[PDB]
Amino acid sequence: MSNFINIHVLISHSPSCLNRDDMNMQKDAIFGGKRRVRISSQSLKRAMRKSGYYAQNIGESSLRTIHLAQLRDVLRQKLGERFDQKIIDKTLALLSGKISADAVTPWVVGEIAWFCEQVAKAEADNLDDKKLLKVLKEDIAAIRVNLQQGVDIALSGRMATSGMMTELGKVDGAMSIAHAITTHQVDSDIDWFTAVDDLQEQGSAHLGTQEFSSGVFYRYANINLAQLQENLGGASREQALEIATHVVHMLATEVPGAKQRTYAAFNPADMVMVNFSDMPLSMANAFEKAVKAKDGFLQPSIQAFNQYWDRVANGYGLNGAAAQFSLSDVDPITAQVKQMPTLEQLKSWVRNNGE
Amino acid sequence: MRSYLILRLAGPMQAWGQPTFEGTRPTGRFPTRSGLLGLLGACLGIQRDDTSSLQALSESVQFAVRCDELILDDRRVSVTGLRDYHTVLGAREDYRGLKSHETIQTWREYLCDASFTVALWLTPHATMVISELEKAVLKPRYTPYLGRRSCPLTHPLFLGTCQASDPQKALLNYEPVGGDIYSEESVTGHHLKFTARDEPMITLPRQFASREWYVIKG
Amino acid sequence: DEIDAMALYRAWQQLDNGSCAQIRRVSEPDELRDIPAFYRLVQPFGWENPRHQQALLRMVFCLSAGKNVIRHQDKKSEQTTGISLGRALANSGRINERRIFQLIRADRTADMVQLRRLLTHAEPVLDWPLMARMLTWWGKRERQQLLEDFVLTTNKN
Amino acid sequence: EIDAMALYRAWQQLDNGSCAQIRRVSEPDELRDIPAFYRLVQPFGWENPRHQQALLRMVFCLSAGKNVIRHQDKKSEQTTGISLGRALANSGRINERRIFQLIRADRTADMVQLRRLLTHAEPVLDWPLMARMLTWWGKRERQQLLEDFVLTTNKNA
Amino acid sequence: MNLLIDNWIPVRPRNGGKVQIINLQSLYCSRDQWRLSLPRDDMELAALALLVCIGQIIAPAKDDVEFRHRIMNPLTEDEFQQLIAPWIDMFYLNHAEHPFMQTKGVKANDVTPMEKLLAGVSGATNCAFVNQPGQGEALCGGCTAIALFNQANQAPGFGGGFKSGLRGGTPVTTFVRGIDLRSTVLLNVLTLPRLQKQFPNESHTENQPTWIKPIKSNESIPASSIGFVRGLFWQPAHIELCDPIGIGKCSCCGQESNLRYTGFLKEKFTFTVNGLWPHPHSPCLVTVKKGEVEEKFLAFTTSAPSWTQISRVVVDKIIQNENGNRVAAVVNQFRNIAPQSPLELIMGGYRNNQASILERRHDVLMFNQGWQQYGNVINEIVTVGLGYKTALRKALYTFAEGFGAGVSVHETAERHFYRQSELLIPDVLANVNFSQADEVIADLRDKLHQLCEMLFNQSVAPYAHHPKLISTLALARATLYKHLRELKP
């Protein structure tokens, strides 16, 4: 019954450039005094949210539609202190245009409440409904659209432009994604390219440059189960865990799109670990002391992670179910961490609350 | 004489804000009062409209922040900074409706290699008690982060609990000792102050009022 | 910039009996500089600023008459200041006019000694921050104003 | 005035025999009974009677050992360096009552006790400032020593 | 509402707590010690400036004697009432024919929101995304007057045909700071002789406010012909506040008010002020190119730290032949009046791209006593800093281009440099003893030297594994140690 799901991933990409700045230079950061290459949280999370897998398993979930119909009673009990039921059901009739739920997502309550306020203010001055609809047709279209994307909004949070209006409408995602930094110091490379002119191949060419690098990145993300449930209208823990499994999959497979058509770093992760916890922690300090290559960076990184876990986990209060999948057979993490031969078994273990 | 709660705020990246109404989002060098209140808020699952709970929190708790320097393999690593060219496409053009900009741009500053030890205590007019705060920090309800949500913690938020007369005295029991301390309470030998605009005006959303830290140099 | 009087007052009230005891043994304001407990007492109140030292030395010295010899009382909302030292001394009914006479005519150091004796003897009730300002300047004008307030009070009351 | 760092550097480079011979005194005036002393302090104006008392004190403290008093230059930021009292307090080896009984100790009792404190605490300090303090050494320089001690101890805690 | 009579000034006790709203008489005639309190520093600067102007027209001292005297002692209420008497009918926010800083009878198709007076809340395409909404819903009388003043002074103009203020757009304002708001306001008021030395008031020069004697459309105004009252309260735009709504909460202050404002009207309007009005609140850069001279008021143009502008704000430079610099009149005055006093200087300003605020700045600089006379020292500290900065920038620029690595790192590196410099130079300026300062300055140069080395190596580090780069890296390092050696006296 722990509240937080921690997801750790070590993924190695080949020479590429998955994220750069306004000066077309790879993003970076400094960790432990040494420069790591960075893939911003934003870059990664978009990579996820705009992905096909996300569409299919989040954008098309059965919990995606919120039926205003079933929310009548509860909405009335929650808004009865501020509004008379006349304007409440007027309102719900406008919005919907046409099983009783015992609980409701806060952003729904908040936005609804805004619409009620507008309806009341409209009635107090004999404004008639046709022109009321005219005035706020836009807002209605919007909230209608958000009412059929309840899981997307619950996992990632409101879209950048959403028509949300109130303060409860500021909807945070339940998954937080951390920026990804390399486990090691990077020797950046610099491509010097030209552009042949087929009609005058001669002459002296004008060279351009592009920075690029390969590296072993540590992705971290966590999921707040309680908030996921609360923002799905009181869903069950099992349903939250389903959505969570989709986040594990994505964080292990999706890669930002940048420069991929010319550098093609389409790499799956070589280690994924999931870990239940009361307090979400990043294990990034496994690499505070930058990793030094020894037959590559992947193995020393995995080893550094396993060993850091062995060293601190118990003391840091990471007492909760824990599993690890990896394609690299390095000296294993401790035995309280149950090994998964395949990603899918890891997923289903998450699906089963870690048993 | 007084009982303190001791927290550690540590992660690869942090961000603690300064006055801005622009697309560049600045950081200072240590946690802001507003931000610490926000951290505690997140632990005590307080929704953003809950002005009562927010006010209770703000009036109950006070902080002292120590800036811990990092040491790797017997060498000092100074806190440095970072600017992220942060882009948003499909961003709202207006608060009402659904028209949106192709691309907008923001610049966001972070702290690198930063770590803090915070001591908090209760006020005489406290609506709360420390047991609550401890329970919360150990089992938070909303996701806790260091400034921004992209900034995980690399060490449990709870460090310890103790009892002393100063904040200074309290913090002495917890390594690393030697960093500067910014306290909401005065410490007798020390006279310097540091002005900020941390204090959240709870009655007026997303607006902050000036306050002053007391500085205890190390 | 200006010295907090009320803070110092309350500080003196809540001082541990041993420290108070250590301070109560001076027989002359400058002797306060021989005493650790003193520096610990006045450190928060700007002792380290040379401008405020003489002033502080007097304040503490008078307070050093006893832990509650100087009873502070707030002024009434109506009037602009509270009870002056002279007035309180007169109100006590224990202070003879000639005492004030010889007080305002005394040399430096001696005056403060005498004053402290008068305070122990009277246990005055007065506006302490007012007295504190007075001690802050303590010149001809102030001594004179002391005796005047005494005389006029004793006259009506 | 008397050159301080010169006297210090001379003391650091004195020959160990003279050095041990000087250390052996038990009272500043006994230095007058020693040749090595005169040769040491002559380049620094011992021949001028105004400077004599002072020198006697300075050397006496230095006589604690060739490397008991550790000079450290003031940081360019700070207007003055580390004074004696701060140094002693910083040592963590000195008890407040030693300092208290030091400043209340009579000519002569005084220097002996100070030297004992110096050997015990092996303080790091701005030497020329100490030298000045020793040049004058009157009620207020003593009281200032106690101030720095007490206030530093309170600051640091 | 009337600025001289009614309560508008947002303050909290210097030491104290709960905010209250006083009137000018309570400020000028009370030994109560006040400090401004709004949720924004730019609006506090707007406020302070407004108050200073006000005081500058109602009560300039007749000599330094009186100046010191009134700083040390508040006025009597009667003195005050006598002083403000002839001005009252000029400071009415809502008035029949002369509204404060507004223009009666404005032709506008639609109502402009109140937010457009709040510099920064909107104006750029990323504002709706990063900013909290509703801040311009309904404003106090005070928040409004103050915003109005800020818009006609330090903020950028609305755009198209909305002329900027008299000092140009986005000037830097520098004030002397005191113990309370009272003494502050008084401390930045030019005494009568200095005032008339700077502005000789003729029958030739118009000295009436803009909202009483309007600027004529497309008039060509000789700058010299503007009187200190007309200019200090200059309003270059045609604005007119809509009728106020009822009781409620300043969506800016958080305070409640009897009347609150929800929109205003504006229309385009153009004129031309030939010359430079000698505003007493801002520094003024002078560059003489090709015999011709140009004076221009100081403005934040770059993102570089505030210390890089300190020389332009405290140090005079009057050399005919060359570029020089004039500090703000109030600072020169204070420099004369208080030649034994330290300085606590308030500076602030915006950095903009048309109507877009790109950055806001507000600093309270400190200076030890020697600042009036030892400006050369200050100047040297500042140019030391920039000197080392350019050392680094030139070196890494070399690394990028040649006489090339192919990557530019010098900008990042400058950001690092500047961020550490913020911990170094302002401290120096605040605590150095100008009379004898060579030691501190030399220490600074060593710290900055180390810094440039560290950042140079850090910056080229990731690329130095390829021999072809180590080649040009050697040359770059060479130019670095060049430039770095030329910074040692």
- Domain of residue B57: give its range: 1-218
Give the Cα separation of D123 and D141 in Å (integer).
18
CB atoms under 10 Å from CB of A238, counted, come to 10
Query: Does B186 sit within 8 Å of C43, measured CB to CB?
Result: no
Q: D27 to chain B, minimum CA–CA distance in Å?
A: 37
Q: How many inter-chain contacts (A to B, CB under 8 Å) are there?
A: 143
Give the Cα separation of A20 and A26 in Å (integer).
4
User: C-alpha angle with apex A254: A249 to A256, nearest 5 degrees?
Assistant: 160
- Residue numbers in C near D143 (CB within 8 A): 33-34
C48 in contact with D, Cβ within 8 Å? yes
- Residue E471, CA distances (Å) to E193, E394, E407, E467, E475 in order: 66, 17, 15, 6, 7
Nearest-CB residue to B143 (from A32, A280, A282): A280
Nearest-CB residue to D96 (from C33, C36, C48): C36
DSSP structure string for E190-239: --HHHHHHH----SSSB-S-TTTSPPPTT-EEEGGGB-HHHHHT---SEE
By CB neighbour count within 10 A (0-12 exposed, 13-18 middle, 19+ buried), where does A347 fall? buried
Given a contact cutoff of 8 angstroms between Cβ atoms, the answer to whether E358 and E351 are in contact is yes
Give the Cα separation of E379 and E310 in Å (integer).
8
Residue A284 neighbours by CB under 8 Å, 6+ apart = A31, A178, A181, A218, A220, B11, B12, B152, B154
Give the Cα separation of A280 and D69 in Å (integer).
54
Q: Which of B144, B60, B157 is closest to B116 using CA atoms?
A: B157
Q: Which of A210, A249, A207 is closest to A18 using CA atoms?
A: A210
Residue A215, Cα to own-chain centre: how many angstroms? 22
Q: Name the β-bridge partners of E151.
A: none
Given a contact cutoff of 8 angstroms between Cβ atoms, the answer to whether E218 and E271 are in contact is yes
- Residue numbers in B near D151 (CB within 8 A): 189
- Residue A313, CA distances (Å) to A268, A316, B142 in order: 26, 5, 22
Long-range contacts of A292-300 (CB under 8 A, 24+ apart): A292/A184, A293/A184, A297/A12, A297/A183, A297/A184, A297/A215, A297/A216, A298/A10, A298/A12, A298/A216, A298/A270, A298/A328, A299/A328, A299/A330, A300/A183
SS3 state at A138: helix
Residue E302 neighbours by CB under 8 Å, 6+ apart = E308, E351
SS3 state at A5: strand
E443 in contact with D, Cβ within 8 Å? yes
Whether omega before B176 lies within 30 degrees of 0, making that bond cis, reads: yes
Give the Cα separation of C147 and C129 in Å (integer).
19
How many residues are present in chain E?
489
CB atoms under 10 Å from CB of A120, counted, come to 17
D38 in contact with C, Cβ within 8 Å? no
CB atoms under 10 Å from CB of D96, counted, come to 13
Amino acid at site E430: A
Q: At how many degrees (to 10) do helices B33-43 and B51-60 cross?
A: 120
Query: What pairing do the DSSP bridges indicate for beta strands B2-10 and B115-122?
Result: antiparallel
For A175, phi then psi, to 5°, come to -90, 130
Query: Does E462 sit within 8 Å of A35, measured CB to CB?
Result: yes
Chains in contact with B via at least 3 Cβ–Cβ pairs below 8 Å: A, C, D, E
Query: Does D146 sit within 8 Å of C40, measured CB to CB?
Result: no
By CB neighbour count within 10 A (0-12 exposed, 13-18 middle, 19+ buried), where does C60 fall? buried
Tokens of E462: 């990731």
CB atoms under 10 Å from CB of C51, counted, come to 9
Q: Name the β-bridge partners of B116.
A: B9, B67
Amino acid at site C41: L
Q: Where does residue B73 fall: left (phi above 0), alpha (psi -120 to 50 degrees), or beta otherwise?
A: left
Amino acid at site E217: S
Chains A and C touch (3+ CB pairs under 8 A): no
3-state secondary structure D83-101: CHHHHHHHHCCCCHHHHHH
- Residue E343, CA distances (Å) to B105, E337, E379 in order: 39, 12, 16
- Report the half-sphere exposure of E389 (CA within 13 A, side-chain side): 22
Give the Cα separation of C156 and E401 in Å (integer).
94
Amino acid at site D56: L
Nearest-CB residue to A316 (from B112, B140, B156): B156
How many residues are present in chain D?
157
Q: E383 to chain B, minimum CA–CA distance in Å?
A: 24
Tokens of E130: 């990063």
Residue C48, Cα to own-chain centre: how many angstroms? 21
Give the Cα separation of E405 and E465 in Å (integer).
12
By CB neighbour count within 10 A (0-12 exposed, 13-18 middle, 19+ buried), where does A355 fall? exposed
For A64, phi then psi, to 5°, come to -75, -20
Give the Cα separation of B11 and B200 in Å (integer).
24
Given a contact cutoff of 8 angstroms between Cβ atoms, the answer to whether B112 and A28 are in contact is no
Query: Does E360 sit within 8 Å of B21, measured CB to CB?
Result: yes
Q: Where does residue E426 fall: left (phi above 0), alpha (psi -120 to 50 degrees), or beta otherwise?
A: alpha
Mutate to test the interface with B, among E11, E125, E356 (most CBs of B within 10 A): E125
CB atoms under 10 Å from CB of E177, counted, come to 18
Nearest-CB residue to C40 (from D100, D104, D154): D154
Q: For residue B188, what is the nearest residue in chain C, using CA coordinates?
A: C44
Q: Which residues of C touch B (CB under 8 A)?
A: 43-44, 48
User: C-alpha angle with apex E418: E416 to E422, nearest 5 degrees?
Assistant: 120
Query: Does C48 sit within 8 Å of B188, measured CB to CB?
Result: no
Q: For residue A160, what is the nearest residue in chain B, using CA coordinates?
A: B91
Tokens of B158: 């709870």
Specify the DSSP element, H or E, that contains E12: strand E7-13
Tokens of A72: 């009548």
Query: Does A279 sit within 8 Å of B140, measured CB to CB?
Result: yes
- Residue E266, CA distances (Å) to B164, E109, E235, E371 in order: 61, 9, 12, 45
Residue C3 neighbours by CB under 8 Å, 6+ apart = C45, C46, C52, C55, C56, C59, C132, C136
The approach used to solve this structure was X-ray
Q: Which of A280, A171, A240, A220 is closest to B144 using CA atoms?
A: A280
CB atoms under 10 Å from CB of C85, counted, come to 27
- Report the half-sphere exposure of E152 (CA within 13 A, side-chain side): 24
Number of domain units in chain A: 1
Give the Cα separation of A209 and C96 in Å (integer).
98
3-state secondary structure chain D: CCCHHHHHHHHHCCCHHHHHHHHCCCCHHHHHHCHHHHHHHHHHCCCCHHHHHHHHHHHHHHCCCCCCCEECCCCCCCCCCCCHHHHHHHHCCCCHHHHHHHHCCCCCHHHHHHHHHHHHHCCEECHHHHHHHHHHCCHHHHHHHHHHHHHHHHHHC
Q: For residue D76, what is the nearest residue in chain E, using CA coordinates?
A: E440
User: C-alpha angle with apex E453: E451 to E457, nearest 5 degrees?
Assistant: 120
SS3 state at A144: helix
Query: Does B154 sit within 8 Å of A285, measured CB to CB?
Result: yes
Which spans in E372-466 are helix H? 375-400, 410-431, 438-460
- Give the right CATH number for C1-157 from 1.20.1050.140, 1.10.630.10, 1.10.520.40, 1.20.1540.10: 1.10.520.40
Which spans in A202-353 are helix H? 225-230, 237-253, 260-263, 298-312, 343-351
Query: Does A35 sit within 8 Å of E461, measured CB to CB?
Result: yes
- Residue numbers in E near B92 (CB within 8 A): 128-129
SS3 state at B100: strand
- Residue C71, CA distances (Å) to C88, C97, C125 in order: 10, 21, 5
- Residue numbers in B near E121 (CB within 8 A): 21
CB atoms under 10 Å from CB of E258, counted, come to 11
Residue E190 neighbours by CB under 8 Å, 6+ apart = E56, E60, E198, E280, E329, E330, E333
Give the Cα separation of E138 and E118 in Å (integer).
12
Q: A49 to chain B, minimum CA–CA distance in Å?
A: 13
Helix and strand tally (H, E) in chain A? 13, 10
Query: Does D96 sit within 8 Å of C34, measured CB to CB?
Result: no
B window 57-86, beta carbon within 8 A of E: 80-81, 83
Query: Does B189 sit within 8 Å of D156, measured CB to CB?
Result: yes
Give the Cα separation of B198 and E340 in Å (integer).
35
Residue A246, Cα to own-chain centre: how many angstroms? 10
Q: Which of E242, E238, E248, E245 is closest to E93 using CA atoms?
A: E242
Query: Does A25 sit within 8 Å of E408, measured CB to CB?
Result: yes
CB atoms under 10 Å from CB of A166, counted, come to 18
Q: Where does residue A26 fall: left (phi above 0), alpha (psi -120 to 50 degrees), or beta otherwise?
A: beta
Q: Which residues of D touch B (CB under 8 A)?
A: 151-152, 154-157
| A131-163 exposure pattern, b = at least 16 Cβ within 10 A, e = fewer | ebeeebeebeebbeebbebbbbbbbbbbbebbb
Read off the CATH number of the domain in which B102 is found.
3.30.70.2660
Amino acid at site E421: S
CB atoms under 10 Å from CB of D139, counted, come to 11
SS3 state at A170: coil
Give the Cα separation of E479 and E393 in Å (integer).
11
